[PDB]
Paper text:
Integration is carried out by the virally encoded integrase (IN) enzyme, which forms a higher-order nucleoprotein assembly (intasome) and catalyzes the 3′-end resection of a linear reverse-transcribed viral DNA and the subsequent direct attack on a target cellular DNA backbone by the nascent viral DNA 3′-OH termini. The structure together with functional analyses reveal that the B56γ (B’γ) subunit of an essential host enzyme, protein phosphatase 2 A (PP2A), is repurposed as an integral component of the intasome to mediate HTLV-1 integration.
In accordance with these observations, the cryo-EM density map shows a complex with the total mass of 320 kDa, including an IN tetramer bound to a strand-transfer product DNA and two molecules of B56γ. HTLV-1 intasome has a twofold symmetric structure that shares the conserved intasome core (CIC)10 with the intasome assemblies of other genera of retroviruses. The IN tetramer consists of two inner catalytic and two outer non-catalytic subunits. CTD of the non-catalytic outer INs further contribute to the extensive viral DNA interaction, bridging between the two viral DNAs attached to opposing strands of the target DNA. The target DNA shows a kink at each of the viral/target DNA junctions 6 bp apart, resulting in a total bending of ~80° away from the intasome core. CCD and CTD of the outer non-catalytic IN are bound toward either end of the banana boat-shaped B56γ monomer, while the inter-domain linker between CCD and CTD takes a U-shaped conformation and makes an anchoring interaction in the central peptide-binding cleft of B56γ. B56γ appears to stabilize each IN dimer, help organize the CCD–CTD linkers, and position CTDs for viral DNA interactions.
Numbering used by the authors:
A (entry chain C), D (entry chain A): 0 to 275
B (entry chain E), F (entry chain F): 30 to 33, 35 to 109, 125 to 372
C (entry chain D), E (entry chain B): 1 to 36, 52 to 274
DNA sequence: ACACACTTGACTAGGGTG
DNA sequence: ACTGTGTACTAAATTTCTCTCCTGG
DNA sequence: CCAGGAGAGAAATTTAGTACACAGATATCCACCCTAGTCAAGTGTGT
DNA sequence: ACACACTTGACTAGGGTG
DNA sequence: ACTGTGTACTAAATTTCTCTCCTGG
DNA sequence: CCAGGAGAGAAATTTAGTACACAGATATCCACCCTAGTCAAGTGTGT
């Protein structure tokens, strides 16, 4: 068809086809079977997963480690935050050992609270064997995010930014005072003297009172039906879409696609593009 | 036996009312314990159902819930002790509390179902010796008294009765503190000038109370009461002068030194206008209690040359205390 | 677990049956590892420095203990100058809570002008204890001795553990899993019970609400909202709008009407 | 006091002030007298000056030079665009010396049409004295952009993206065809066969027909009144805000301003944190 | 400018007074530099390949010329296989316009299926000439000889030029700055006069509009919009809505209602 | 003298009407040229003012603008020539065109101000020899004819008058092509079945026109007319059979070979239903014009064994042309 | 009874994720 | 003396129509 | 007996509203932890 | 006629923007 | 088996009030 | 003679709606063009 093979020779927009003289609906059909004309435009209409975690109870925590103040002393800090009530515990000095991470977690438990889940990045100080041996010694689960995906920990990443630029404020002023206490102070602030939205409580007091409340429940996930869809390797190797044939096992926000290595992988929907 | 489905409040008032069988649980559970656990699971469903929806709480159940309450715990206690059946009474409680502060509780309806002899059949439970229920009972009373008016002043009189009957003799009521807190919540919620009734019943029984002994078990909260009493009512401070002083103890004891610790933590809201007439009767005991038989009065009677403004008061208007303060 | 949670922390007799052990399963747990200035509610504090039996070097640790509840927060240092006591307090104050009447003996670390130049900056009445006033020792030392015991009950076993986790764990147990009197309240529970709201007279009501909130975005579509009715929960995060499905959810939310 | 200077010791939020018992708006005054709190929080509420030129009937070209995928060899494409009708002319083969850029302009002018202004970035092949002498020999103006600011050329930078992903489409299919005539192809389907936008007129037509129209008038850049702004060096040196005192010659969008070198640049407003 | 524009461009006698020179000064420009099958309305084409004076190696001018207007589009290359006779055509089509009848000659570069394997893929009737039909030569050759003489007019002066600019410039002058006959139209403006709209009977109305629509953002504020007003102009970019100040602007617009 | 300010259309109708002084500009501009340039600047302002606003074009000016038009150019021309005062007439034109297609021109008002003798005092201007004005005059007539109905059919008759008077004798009208285009715009805008009047006036004068000579100056456009004529009206092709054939030229000339080039570019819409009766009278000249005195007819008369469907027609229904096509 | 048939080991190298 | 922007992609409005089949002319 | 006609698809077809990415480009280093191979000290045979 | 005063240059060196 | 988010910053609504000073008790 | 009361600031004070950036980090190379100095062929002094 002078309409159809015209697109099959130029890849012109549907409106041009219309003006060539074929009705819109057939145009729209054409523009969803020009497989190349589909594999190149990156346009990404899948629905966002804003789903960092559900928080029916308190105590599903989150971990992350950060580098501060490398004027002369790189200043490594560890932070754990709670995601029912946005309360932050933070301990630095320099190191990276598993034994250091462990001593930090063990210290955050003396502050509040005593969690029941956990999840961090892929890990190394967290991937240690003795680390998870400490975990299991405390009857705690543990999970890891997908590799190479920073937004996965959106919450912590933001609470980091909040903490740094409060430190920076203090250190613009009063530029002598030692970090040990200019940190203890910036914490007492973040916990006791701020409010968030019309929630209009101080993170801490919100973290304290409402546990007097019960726990709703939604379980028995179901309704699994596959689909088929070409997008993209998630190694930041941004390029044309990367087409896979199709999902081995559906999920909620994520997916599971056999890379040609016949290997399972869990791509998040922020990287996919649906097909027939 | 269980459910969640026709969505008929009648089938749910059934689920509620069908707990109408009652266990005698002194020492004999052997007979079909299963009715017991199923009851527990029943009320569990009932509670989170009430958290579930909005339209659940219509009239036909109101006198039934209050009856189910009364039938479930309105009975005597043996005059540090806890409950065997505790998580059961701890659930009828939590269910009722959440029932009370539920949004869809209209007071104008329940007004006829809230009863004065009922609340008397509630307050006498504070005499028990389980602290746990003595907490749920605290909070629930605080909700009733916050959510009604006639019974508000009524219970005020009822407790003044208890007060009288308690202070004048040796009642080991052992459940006082929980009202001293409901008191403090009240005495905060005032706006003077007002009726003297309150302050009157305070100068009537509240301060004479200190004739009592064993004060450690109710001292802090009563101190927090007297301070919530003063602010702003505190101008009502002029007549407080010498009250404890005449109620001052006689013998040597850490009771007296605790009461000193009190008196030390109460000289905070002085204002020099009426303070003319009081600094002298103050020192007529304070400077004159060196004759106490303690070994501590050697530095007890001299803890007031050391403040910021108490000292400045000693240098503010010293035109009358100057020879009495020992040079 | 309870035999293991014991060997993990070495509690006693009382606070274990509340995890699932019977009466005798608590006394037999004791048979396991055998023989191993008023009340001032809230925030009128007290504190102290202490030596400590070394591992090979005497660790000097300060501490701050409340007087109303009986909580504890403390740390360990090597030097004990005023800059140290300062950093210690300031940490405890980022722990709970923020006081208004602090008391101590008259050691040199309590004299220095910098210390004053910090207390004054926080509206904190700093009094002076009478030095060598042990009429308050039986209670402060009740606490301190607790720590001393617990620590030795820790590193008499597996002594290779570092000399800080012993402190962390020591606290986490001493402030979440104990009651001494019949109060049936942990120190740290009690110390943060949200205070009872004082009732106002002649307006016997309450205000607990925010009405709709047009809601959308349960799932996977952008469209008009749904009329979002009340919210019976709230938290950084979401708000529990009860869906018309007679069911509940959690969403980061759209509108804010008046209520 | 405790209301007043508390911010001067913690830098807590205004809400925390009022809730500890301070006033209602003098809070807002306090939170604009912490030079620290301003030198640290980032925000650009200054309006989105967003504007090209183009009022003329299609006579400001605005054209830049770029790269291309290597089958086994780089391919340099120069591309000039118009700014009133989005028409694109593009000539590539390998070299980006001045003399070739010149021969490109000299060709992309035959294809419509002889301009009256021109605009570009600081690329060397354009800073050439020889290019400049050619330009002047042809009675044209010439201008640059503030250096180190890619958005400045938004229009052409985008028409680049458009041209690349059209090429890629073709070279997905039929991957043998010579890498030049498939350019003449794309250039057709970009100018004649593709309805632009809501205007609904193919660029080509929009570029020819309306020349019958007159020229409206607008003039008098005037009414100068300075201000002070502390914001950020524009050398990608993202950091705390960089504070100067104050503009010498304000202008539309941009703003002349001296750095401490007693030297004067024109920081695009998009990097200025207003403070008077 | 006219003496330099002259030597830079340097076509001829007619189309120069429209830049500012008078009658005699135009003839005194000629005195200057001492060196100077039907008619087939738009898109029924014709083309040809041509040799050229070897500067030292002859190049293969390869050209296409319309028959209605008389425009030109050509290029330079070395070989003459259908590979690039194609690439030449295809480029001319990216230039203007897209034809429907291509008649050049019976050359092998036209014989090859590679050629027809492209033409057929574009729905392009291929009608080719009777070879050796010079009854059309006096005209296509009029064009070609123009190209020839213009090139030598360029580089006989300043032979330092490469043989690309010489062609680019040769065109830009031959197709924007000339008028053939009294028509007083350039080859270009003629070849792209937007055709007169054919008039309907009994529908004797018109549609020149897009409905009013709100507007904001002249300057520096975010708020509700204003107007609406009709918009009397439009272009990729902005749309020239007449602002309420009795004046005009250009904004990248907001709404598109029905009219 | 100039302005833009009271914003009163009366002061602007003044600015308009004050051009009522008229220059005699044959050879004598010496007397105060400045009135001339100021006029040009005036109308420039007037034009962009009309582009400026919406409410500018109210009634009180309509017969004035049309009068200012008539007074400015309604005069005789000397029967390749251009205008000395050209950019002045080129501006009264562009101003009027933009005035015409202005949005706020209501036809129901101007209906009485549009006049039949007026438009006759417009069409006779096409006889001139300036191509430039012959363009503005083209487009403006196309706007009138698109924007009115009575004058629409009226001018149709007027031009048929011109047609008659032109074709039947040697009128060197030299301005025809511009109407042939307005024609093509019309003949496109039709919907048959309809009144035969149009096609009648075509078989009356349009094809007999070819008796004329010098055809090159209007040949293309007329060819485009006849094709716009046929499509789809082309089934109306049955009667076109032999028309040019009888109007076929007689002598030897590139006129005839141009007409061959035409006839070659018109065999495009054949349909075999009526094509039965015509392929023979076609070949009764086409196959029978070898007797022409050209040296070209040797390959002229045989350009039809070479098409795609013309050849398939020679092999479609050849049951009647088979012996006539020379073997 | 010591030379070899047999092990660890330590200790690199290399890879992978932030 | 200088300043972001144009297209793709999918749900939702909205606007044609369209037989079902009711109605009394 | 049937022309306008609710009307439930329906189909069709317009519009609205967000996302994305063009920008000069890669290699190289670093803090850490795990698995796999490579010489370097230790113990049982035969008469 | 073989001792020194005068340019480029070539030809290095270095920097700045994409 | 697994998934972005919280604060800052300014214009605009909107809601207190508020003296001006009019009105008929 | 003055209490409710339009009402024009007004002031005050709430709300709404976008932008920004946390993510492991730098050095090094490359295509080009300009400015500044350094001996090295070429040419001017003194007889
Ligand atoms: Mg990390
Ligand atoms: Mg560039
Ligand atoms: Zn395509
Ligand atoms: Zn033990
Ligand atoms: Zn500040």
């Amino acid at each position: 068809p002078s309409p159809a093979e015209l697109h099959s020779f130029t890849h012109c927009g549907q409106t041009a086809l219309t003006l060539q003289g074929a009705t819109t609906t057939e145009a729209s059909n054409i523009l969803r079977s020009c497989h190349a004309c589909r594999k190149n435009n990156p346009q990404h209409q899948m629905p966002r997963g804003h789903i960092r975690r559900g928080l029916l109870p308190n105590h599903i925590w989150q971990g992350d480690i950060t580098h501060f103040k490398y004027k002369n002393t790189l200043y490594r800090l560890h932070v754990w935050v709670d995601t029912f009530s946005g309360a932050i515990s933070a301990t630095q000095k320099r190191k990276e050992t598993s034994s250091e991470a462990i001593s930090s977690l063990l210290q955050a438990i003396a502050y509040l609270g005593k969690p029941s889940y956990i999840n961090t990045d892929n890990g190394p100080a967290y991937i240690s064997q003795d680390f998870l041996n400490m975990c299991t010694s405390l009857a705690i689960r543990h999970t890891t995010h997908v590799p190479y995906n920073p937004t996965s920990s959106g919450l912590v990443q933001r609470s980091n930014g909040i903490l740094k630029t409060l430190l920076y404020k203090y250190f613009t002023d009063k530029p002598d005072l030692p970090m040990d206490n200019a940190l203890s102070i910036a914490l007492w602030t973040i916990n006791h003297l701020n409010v968030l939205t019309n929630c209009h409580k101080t993170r801490w007091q919100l973290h304290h009172s409402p546990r007097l409340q019960p726990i709703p429940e939604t379980r028995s996930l179901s309704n699994k039906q596959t689909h088929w869809y070409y997008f993209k390797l998630p190694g930041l190797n941004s390029r044309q879409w990367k087409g896979p044939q199709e999902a081995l096992q559906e999920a909620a926000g994520a997916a599971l696609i056999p890379v040609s290595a016949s290997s399972a992988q869990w791509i998040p929907w922020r990287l996919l593009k649906r097909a027939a | 036996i269980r459910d969640v489905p026709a969505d008929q409040e009648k089938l749910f008032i059934q689920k509620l009312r069908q707990c109408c069988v009652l266990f005698d649980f002194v020492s004999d559970p052997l007979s079909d314990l299963k009715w017991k656990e199923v009851k527990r699971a029943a009320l569990s469903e009932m509670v989170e159902y009430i958290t579930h929806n909005r339209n659940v709480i219509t009239e036909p159940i109101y006198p039934e819930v209050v009856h189910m309450f009364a039938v479930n715990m309105f009975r005597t206690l043996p005059p540090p002790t806890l409950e065997a059946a505790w998580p059961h009474l701890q659930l009828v409680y939590e269910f009722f509390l959440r029932f009370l502060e539920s949004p869809d509780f209209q007071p104008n309806i329940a007004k006829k179902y809230i009863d004065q002899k009922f609340v008397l059949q509630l307050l006498e439970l504070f005499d028990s010796e389980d602290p746990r229920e003595r907490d749920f009972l605290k909070t629930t009373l605080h909700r009733i008294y916050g959510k009604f008016l006639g019974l508000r002043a009524y219970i005020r009189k009822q407790i003044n009765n208890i007060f009288y009957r308690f202070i004048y003799e040796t009642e080991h009521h052992n459940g006082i503190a929980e009202l001293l807190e409901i008191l403090g919540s009240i005495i905060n919620g005032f706006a003077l000038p007002l009726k003297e009734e309150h302050k009157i019943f305070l100068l009537k029984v509240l301060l004479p109370l200190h004739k009592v002994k064993s004060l450690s078990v109710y001292h802090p909260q009563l101190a927090y009461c007297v301070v919530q009493f003063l602010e702003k009512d505190s101008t009502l401070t002029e007549p407080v002068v010498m009250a404890l002083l005449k109620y001052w103890p006689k013998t040597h004891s850490p009771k007296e030194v605790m009461f000193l610790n009190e008196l030390e933590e109460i000289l905070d809201v002085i204002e020099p206008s009426e303070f003319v007439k009081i600094m002298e009767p103050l020192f007529r005991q304070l400077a004159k209690c060196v004759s106490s038989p303690h070994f501590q009065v050697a530095e007890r009677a001299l803890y007031y040359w050391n403040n910021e403004y108490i000292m400045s008061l000693i240098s503010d208007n010293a035109a009358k205390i100057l020879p009495i303060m020992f040079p």
